[PDB]
Design a protein around this ligand. Sequence first.
Ligand SMILES: *[C@@H]1O[C@H](CO)[C@@H](O[C@@H]2O[C@H](CO)[C@@H](O[C@@H]3O[C@H](CO[C@H]4O[C@H](CO)[C@@H](O)[C@H](O)[C@@H]4O)[C@@H](O)[C@H](O[C@H]4O[C@H](CO)[C@@H](O)[C@H](O)[C@@H]4O)[C@@H]3O)[C@H](O)[C@H]2NC(C)=O)[C@H](O)[C@H]1NC(C)=O
Lengths: 186, 187, 187, 188, 189, 189, 142, 137, 135, 143, 142, 145
Amino acid sequence: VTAFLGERVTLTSYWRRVSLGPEIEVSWFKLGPGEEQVLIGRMHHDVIFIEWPFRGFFDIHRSANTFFLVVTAANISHDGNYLCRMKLGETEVTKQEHLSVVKPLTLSVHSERSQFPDFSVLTVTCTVNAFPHPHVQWLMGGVMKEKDGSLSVAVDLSLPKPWHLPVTCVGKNDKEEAHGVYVSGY
Amino acid sequence: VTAFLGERVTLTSYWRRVSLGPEIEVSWFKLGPGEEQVLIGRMHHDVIFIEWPFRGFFDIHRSANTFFLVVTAANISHDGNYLCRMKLGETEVTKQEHLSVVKPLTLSVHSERSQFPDFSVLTVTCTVNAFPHPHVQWLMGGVMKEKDGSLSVAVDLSLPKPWHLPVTCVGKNDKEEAHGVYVSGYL
Amino acid sequence: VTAFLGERVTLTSYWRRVSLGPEIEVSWFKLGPGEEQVLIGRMHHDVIFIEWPFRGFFDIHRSANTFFLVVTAANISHDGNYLCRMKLGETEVTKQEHLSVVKPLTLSVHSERSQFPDFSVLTVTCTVNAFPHPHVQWLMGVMKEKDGSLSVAVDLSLPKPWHLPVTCVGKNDKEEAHGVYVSGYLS
Amino acid sequence: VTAFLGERVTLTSYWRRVSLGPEIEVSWFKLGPGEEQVLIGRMHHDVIFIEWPFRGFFDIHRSANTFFLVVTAANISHDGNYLCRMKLGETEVTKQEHLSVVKPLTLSVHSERSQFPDFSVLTVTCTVNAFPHPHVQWLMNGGVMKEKDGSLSVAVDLSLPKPWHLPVTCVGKNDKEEAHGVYVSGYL
Amino acid sequence: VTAFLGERVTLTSYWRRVSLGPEIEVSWFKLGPGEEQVLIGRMHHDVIFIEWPFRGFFDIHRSANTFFLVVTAANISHDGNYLCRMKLGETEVTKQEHLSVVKPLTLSVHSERSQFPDFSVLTVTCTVNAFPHPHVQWLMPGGVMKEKDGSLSVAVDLSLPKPWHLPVTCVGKNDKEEAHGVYVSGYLS
Amino acid sequence: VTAFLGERVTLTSYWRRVSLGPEIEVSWFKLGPGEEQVLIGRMHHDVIFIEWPFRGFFDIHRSANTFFLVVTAANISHDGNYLCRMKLGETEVTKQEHLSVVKPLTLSVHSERSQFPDFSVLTVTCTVNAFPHPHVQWLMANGGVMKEKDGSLSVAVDLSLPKPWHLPVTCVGKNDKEEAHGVYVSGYL
Amino acid sequence: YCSHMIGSGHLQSLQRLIDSQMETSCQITFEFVDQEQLKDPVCYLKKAFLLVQDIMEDTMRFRDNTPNAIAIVQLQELSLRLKSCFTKDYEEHDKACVRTFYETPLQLLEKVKNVFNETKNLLDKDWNIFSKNCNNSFAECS
Amino acid sequence: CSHMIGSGHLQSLQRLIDSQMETSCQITFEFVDQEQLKDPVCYLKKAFLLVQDIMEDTMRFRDNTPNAIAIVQLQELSLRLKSCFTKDDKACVRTFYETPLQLLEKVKNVFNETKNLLDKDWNIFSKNCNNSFAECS
Amino acid sequence: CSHMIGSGHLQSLQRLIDSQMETSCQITFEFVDQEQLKDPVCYLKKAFLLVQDIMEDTMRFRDNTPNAIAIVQLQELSLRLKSCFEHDKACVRTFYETPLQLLEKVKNVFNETKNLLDKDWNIFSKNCNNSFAEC
Amino acid sequence: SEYCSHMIGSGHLQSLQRLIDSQMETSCQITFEFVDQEQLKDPVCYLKKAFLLVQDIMEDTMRFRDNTPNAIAIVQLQELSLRLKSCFTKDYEEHDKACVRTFYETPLQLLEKVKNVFNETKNLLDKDWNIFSKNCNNSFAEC
Amino acid sequence: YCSHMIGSGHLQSLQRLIDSQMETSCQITFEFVDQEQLKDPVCYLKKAFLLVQDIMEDTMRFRDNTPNAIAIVQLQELSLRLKSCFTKDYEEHDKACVRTFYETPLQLLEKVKNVFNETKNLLDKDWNIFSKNCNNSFAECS
Amino acid sequence: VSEYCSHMIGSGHLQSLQRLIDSQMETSCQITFEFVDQEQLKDPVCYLKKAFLLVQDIMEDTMRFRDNTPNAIAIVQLQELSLRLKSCFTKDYEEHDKACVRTFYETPLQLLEKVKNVFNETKNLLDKDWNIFSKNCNNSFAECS
Ligand SMILES: *[C@@H]1O[C@H](CO)[C@@H](O[C@@H]2O[C@H](CO)[C@@H](O[C@@H]3O[C@H](CO[C@H]4O[C@H](CO)[C@@H](O)[C@H](O)[C@@H]4O)[C@@H](O)[C@H](O[C@H]4O[C@H](CO)[C@@H](O)[C@H](O)[C@@H]4O)[C@@H]3O)[C@H](O)[C@H]2NC(C)=O)[C@H](O)[C@H]1NC(C)=O
C-alpha cells in the first residue's frame, strides 16, 4: 500500500482458516535496514500491547480472521517494509507488507538581480520539497535533507539583459508534477 | 529612489553652488511616522559621524558639491522618506528623498487531499511572500507579517472529484508577476 | 471500566441491529467538566479521523456492529466520562461510558533527627503518591504532582527513647501498603 | 566522629600543653583521595582564614588548648579523612580525624501489573536511597545508581503470578539503620 | 566594630558570671530596618543551630563565659546592627553590637576624544566604586549607580577643548580613604 | 594612518593619471597574517560591492582619481595592513596602507589589606587596560598579561606595604606615548 | 396449558439454525441476561424471556421467507403466547439484570437455544413454576 | 461437460446463502481479481482452479450438517470439472475483506456463470489463457 | 530672433571647453530631463528659462577673466532671448557628471537653438503646456 | 658660461596664470604626488627636488585636449623643463622618490603649487644663477 | 584612719590565690576600668574600686569555705569598710570609664592584686588622698 | 615482683590533691586532654593499670603551676610518688601503647576530679590486695582500639 504524510493508514494480515481469530499469536515488526527486525507490538487472545518506542504512533486490533496494524499518523520514518509473524503453537506464518510514504511536493520561486558588476544578470530560483524523488528542471543544484525527513532540491538560472521572459521551471515528484512561471520583474 | 532587499543603495543631496562642498553642515534624518524626525548622522568640514543606533547600516560621505547617504544593506525598516538638512550659517536648505524597498515575491505551491469523510476533496494552497503589496488569486486567506518585516498571504482551493486539472494560481507584487500550475496528483 | 496509568485501554459502543456496521456515523466525545463536549474523533463508512489534539493518544476502529475507542496510553487527564454519538440519518443514539484511571500508590519513608535543641527528637516521614484517593496514617499537606497524580505525607516525632519499631499505613482506596521503621544509625 | 546530612558538625584537635593556645600555628587539610592534601584554612595568634573554595562551608575557631574545625553544613563530599597540622616553631604535630557522613535511608514501594500477555503477573518494586551502604532485599535484579546529592540508590523488583501471595515485605537497610515496606493489597 | 569586604569578622557577647557558659540560652538577631528582629541562630548547652537563610554566612561558637558570632565572609548586606539575647531561666539580658562593612575604593580613569564635530574636545572620565560614601571630584583652578555586590559607584566627566590643559588630576575618596588619578598625555599631539 | 576604538576612519588609494576614476577596477584586501589575502570589496564603473563577512563594517566609494575605504566603526581586529589592487586591463598597481587601531588606556587602583597572618600588609593593585602596548609600573610584584573580549590587552601589578604604610605611593601606567598615573593617599583608618 | 406449549418442532428448527450457520471467528455485540447477577435459574429464564422479543428482531435477521426466517417468526409466535405463562413483576426492574456480550453468532444462538430448551425442561416438570415473585431477585442486579 | 453442473448443485448454494444470518461481520480471503483478469472466459478458468483451496480454508461447517454435505458435493463437482479445464500459481489473485454473505454470492456466481457458458458452448474452456495470465502480476 | 545667436558666442563656448582640464571629477546640477521631455522644440524652451540660475550657481570663474567674460556674454545673450519665448521646476532632474560633460550639454543647448532658429524664427511660440504636464 | 638667468621667460608664466584663470571654480578634489614642503624645508633644495618630479606630474596630471590653448602651454612647460635639467646638478640615485607625499586637493590648488614652483625658481635664478649647484644629498637623507 | 586599713595579710592571700591557680590557655570576659580612658592613677583606683565589689562576686568564685573563698570574703569585707574612705561623685558617671577584657584568670587576678597593692602604697603615703573630686576626669571617658 | 606497695600512697598525698581542687577558681573554661576511656576499658583493675602509665605525661602537660608554690610542690610529690609506683605495675605488650585512650573536653576542675579518683581508687585496691596490679591486661587492652 501507499499513503501520504500525516494520514492514518492501515496495514493488514490474516489467518486463512476463518474459524480462528483471537487464538493466533500475532506480532508485527518493522524491518530496519540490513535485514533487521524491530518489534512493534504483540496481540494474543485479544490483549494488545505496543512497545513503548512505537507507542501512540502504531496500534493493533482484530476482527474475525483479520489483523490490522494502524499507524495513527504517518511520517517519513515509516516508509519501509513491515513483517507480521502469526503463530499457532507449532505452525507459524510470516506475511510481509510494504508501505510507501509520500510528501506532496512544494514548488517555490523567487527572483534576484545580481549586485555586481551590474544589475543586468537576473537570477531566478526554482525549489521543490517532496518525497521520495523530487526533481527540478529549468525549461529551454544542491540536494538537502529537511528536519521532517523529506528531501529538497533547487536550481538557479542566469539571464543577462534583455531578460528573455517569460521562463518556466518544472518540478516533479515521481508521477506528481507542477510548474512555476516567472512573468516580469519589478 | 527604489532598491531591493539586502542591496547597497545610495541617496543623494547637493548644494547648488559648485564652489562649496565641505563647508556645508549636512545632517540626514529618517522621517518616522507622524511627522517625526530621527537623526541618522552629521557631516561638516569632512568629518562624518553616524549615530550609534544607525551605525553600520548607514554611512555618509562627500565628493565636490554632492552629499551621499549610503545604506550599506537595505531592509524593510528602511522604506520611508528621508530628510537632508544642509546649513551654511544663516541660510539652510531642506531636501527630501524617498526610498522604496522591495522584496522579490516568493510563490509557493503544494497539494493535500482531505482525510475526512473521503479522499476526494483535493485542496491546493498557493502562497506568496513579497513586499510591499503581495496578492494571490486562483484562476477559475490570512494576511500575515513575517520576522524580516515582509508580508505573506495565501489562498486554498477545494476541488471535489473529478479534479478539474490542470489549475493555475496567479501571484503578483505590484508590477512583478508569476504563476503556479498544478498538473497531476500522485495517483 | 477501569485501567491503570500507561496502559492500553479500550471503551466500546454498538448498534443494536446486527445488519449495520460501517453505515453508522460514529463520533466520540470527551466530557469536559460542566457538561462540556469535546470532539475526539469520527468514523463513517470505515474511514476514521482523530482530532489533532487527541491524535496518537486515542484511536477508533470497528468490527461488525461494535465500535471501539482505544486509548493507546492512559494518563490522569483521561479519567472522566466519554460520550459516543452514533447516527443513521434522522435517527441518533447517544451512549455514555465512564473510565477511571488509577496510579499504583508509592509509599516512601525516611527518618531525620532534630538538629535543635538536641538530637533526641527523631522525626520520621511517611509519604504516599497515588490516584485518585491517597491517604497516609501513622499507627500509634495535600500536593498535586506534574503527572496529575496526588501526593500526601505525615510526620511523627518520637522523643528518646525511640519507641521503635513504628509503622505507617498508606492506602489508595482498596489498595494498601505499610512502612516500618526498625532502627536508626546508632542508638 | 560521624554526623548526618545537613548538620553542623565539629572536628577537634588540641595541643597537649595546657599553657598554650594562640601560639600554635594550626592549619587543617582535607585528604583528597590518593594521599592528597588540600588546605582548608589556617589559624595563628587568633586570626583565622579559610580558603575561598571552602569558605562558608568550613570555619575554624579556638578555645584554650583546643582547636575546632566546624562544618557549617555537612554534605556527602565531606565524608573523608581530615588532617590537622599544628606547629610550634621547631616542633610540629600531625593529628588525623575521620568523618563519616550519613543520609537517612529513604525506602519506597509501588506495584504494577504486567500488561502482557495478561494482567496476572503483579510486579512490585522496593527502592532505597541512603548513604554510605544502602541495601535492599525481598523476603521469601539490582542496579546501583548515584544521585545528584552524592547519595546512593538501589532497588529490586519481585514478580508474583496469580494468585498473589500477599502480604509481602521488603527490607531496606543502611548499615545499622533498618526499615521495611509491606504491600498489603492491589486495587481490585 | 568595623571590617572590610570578604573578611572573616567576629562579634562578641558574654555572661558577666564566669561560672556559666553553656547554660545560657544564647540567640543572635540581625536588626532589619524599622526595629525588625531576624533570627540568625541559637545556641544552648553547646548545640548550635544557624537558620537556613543565614546558613554558611554566619556561625556561632562558645568558649568559657564568652559568645561569638562569626561572619564567615562579610558582604554589604551585613552592615547593620546586631542583637544578642542571652537568657537564664527567669533573667534575660540583651546586648547590642554594631558592624560597619567597607569596600576599598576603586578609582578608574580613561580618556576619549569627541567624534563630532571635531576631535578637539578631549573628555576624561574619573570613576570610583566604594562603600559606604564614595565621592569623586575633578580639580580646577555624575550619575550615582548601585552595583550587584551592593556597593556604590559614581563618576564624572571633564571636557577640555584644544589645547588640552594637561596634566589634569581627579580626586576620589571614601570617607577617610583617599586616592587620585592623573592624566598625563594623549596618544598623539 | 592611525585611529581610536569605535571611530569612523578612512583609508585611501589613487590613480596617478587625473583622467581616470570609474574605469579602474579597484579591489581592497585585508592582509591576514602569513601573507594571506582576504577580499573586502570591489568597485568598477561606479558600482560597489562589499563581501558579506565585512558588510557594514567597511564600505568603499570614489571621487575623481581617488579611492576610499571607510571603516564605519573601528575595532581591534582591524589593526593590520591593507592592500589595494587597482587594474586597468593589462596594467595593474598594488598600493599598501597600514592602520593602527588604538584603545585609550584605562588605569585602575584599589587597596586591600592582607587577611593573614595580620592586617598590616597593605596591598595595592594598579591596573591598565590599553592597546597595543600597555605597561604598568610602581614607583620605588608579579605581572600577568590578560586578553579581553574586546580584543584589548590588560596588565596589572601589586605592591606590598608593611606597617607603617609609607604613603602616599604612586603607580605609572602607559600605552606607548600615552601616559597616566595613580596615587594612593590614605587607608580607611 | 403451558406444559406442552414448547413443541419439539420448535427446537428442531433452532438446532437447524445453528447447524446451517458457517463457522467463523466473527464477533458481535448484544444485550442478554447476566447469568452471574441473576443466579437463580427460575428467575433467570423468567427475566431473560421477556427481553428476547427485542433481541430476535434486532439480532436474528434473515432474508424474507427463507427456511430460517420462517423459524424466527415461529419463535416470536411461540414467544408471545408464552408471555401469558409469566407473571409480570415491577416495571421499574426493566432493563436491569442485563449485560453486554461480544461473541460469535454461533455462541449467541447457543445461548438462545439453551433458554428455550431449559424452559421446556422446567415447564414439563412443573407448569406453574413461573409464577414465582422475582421482584426480590431483580433487586439483586444493577 | 454441457450438463455437468446439475440444477441440484446450485439448489444447495442458494440454500447456503439463505440459511446464513444477516451480519455486519467481515473476513479476509483469496479470490480472483476481476479487474486484473477482465475476460470472463479466462476469469472463470483461473478462478475455478483456486476454489478447491478456498472452500476448505473458508466454507467450514459442523461435520455432517446439511451445509457441510453441500460443500463436499461442490468439491466433488469441482474435481470432476478439472478435466474440462486445461491445467498442469498465485497470480491474478487478490485479497478481499468482505461479509461471508458476499463471498458466497461470489462463489455462487462462479458456478452459475459457468453453467451458462457451458450450456451455450461446451468446448469453450479450452482457450489458452497463458496470454491473459501474464497481464495480471 | 533669426540672427540673435551670433557665431562669436559659440566661439567662446568651445574655447571654454577646450581650456578646461581633463579630469575624472564629478559634480551635481539641475538640468532638463531629456527623457521626461523628449520633444526638442519644448526641451530647448523649458531648458532655456532655467539656464540663468544655473550659470550663476555653476559656471563661476575668477572675476574678469577670459572665461568669466564669456559667461556674462551668455547671460546677456540669454536675457535678450527671453522675449523670443505651476509648471515651474518640473521636467528637471539631477545629474552627477564631469564639468566637461555639463559644458557639452550647455554648448549643445545654444548650438541646437541656433539651428532651429535659423530654419524657423517663429518656432519657439508653440504651446508646451501639454508637454510640461508629461513630466 | 651659464645663461640660465633668463631661461624662464615672462611668456611662460603668462600662460600658467592663464591656465588657472581659465579653470572653472569647483569643490572637486584629486590626489597627486608632490614634494612634502615640511620634510624638505630648505627652499633651495625644495625647488631642486620638486623640479625633477614635475615632468611625470604634468603628464599624469595636467592633460588637455590636443592642440588647445592650454595643452600648448603644457608642452611649452615640458620643453622649458627639459632645458632646465642641465642647470640642476644630479645627486645620488638612491634618493629617488623620497621627500615626496600625497595631496588630496583641488586642481586650482595644484596649479597654484606648480605656478609657485616655476615663479619662485625665476626669482632665485635672477638673483644668483649658479645657486642650484648645491649638494642636497644631506638634505634628501632627512626625508 | 585609712592608712593601715589594708593589712599585709590581705595581699598575702591575693598572691597565694594567684600562685594556687593552674596554668591554662583559657580566657574569659569581664568588666574593668579602661586604663587608657582614665589615665590618672588617683582617679583610676577611685573608679576601679567601686566596681570591684560586683566583679569579685561575678568572677572570683571558689568552693564554699575553702582557703581561697575565705580570702575572697576577707577582700569583700575589706572592700566594704573602704567605701567610706572614698567620696562618691555624680551618679550619672556610673558605668562609664569601663571596658571589656578577654583574658586569662591569671591576668584578671594580676589586675586586681595590682589595684589593692597600688592602693596600699598611695594610702600609706596620704590617707585622705582619695577624696579629691574626679567628676572632671570621669567625663573624659565614654 | 613488687613488695610493700600497700601503703605507698600516703594519706598526705591525697590531702594535697583535694587542696589542689579546693584552691582552683570556679570557671566556665574547658580544655582538652588524653585520658583512659572508662567505657572501652571497663575492668577497674586494668583501667587503673593503663590509666596510671599515662598520668606521667599528663601532669607535666596539664597540671602546671608557678615554680615552688604550694601546689607545684604537690605536683612534684605526685610525680615522685608516681615514679616509685611504676615498679608495682607489670609492663605489658608494647603494641597496646596509646590504645584504650580518648579525648576529653572538660574543665580543669573535672580533670583534677578524674586524677584524684585514679589515685584514691588505687589506694583502696592497694590496701586490700598489694600484688593485684600484676594481672596481665594484654587481653583487655586488645579490646579497645
Ligand atoms: C533593519 O534595519 C534597522 C535599521 O538599520 C535595524 O534597526 C536597529 O538595529 C540596531 C542593531 O540591531 C538596534 O540596536 C540595538 O539597541 C539595543 C538598545 O540598547 C540600549 O542600551 C544599551 C546598553 O544600556 C546602549 O549601549 C545602547 O546605546 C542603547 O541605548 C542594544 O541593546 C542592542 O545591543 C547592541 O549593543 C551591545 C553592546 O552594548 C552589543 O553586544 C550588541 O551586539 C549590539 O550591538 C542593539 O544595538 C536598534 O535599536 C534598531 N533601530 C532602532 C534604534 O530602533 C534592524 O535591526 C534591522 N532588522 C529588522 C528586523 O528590522
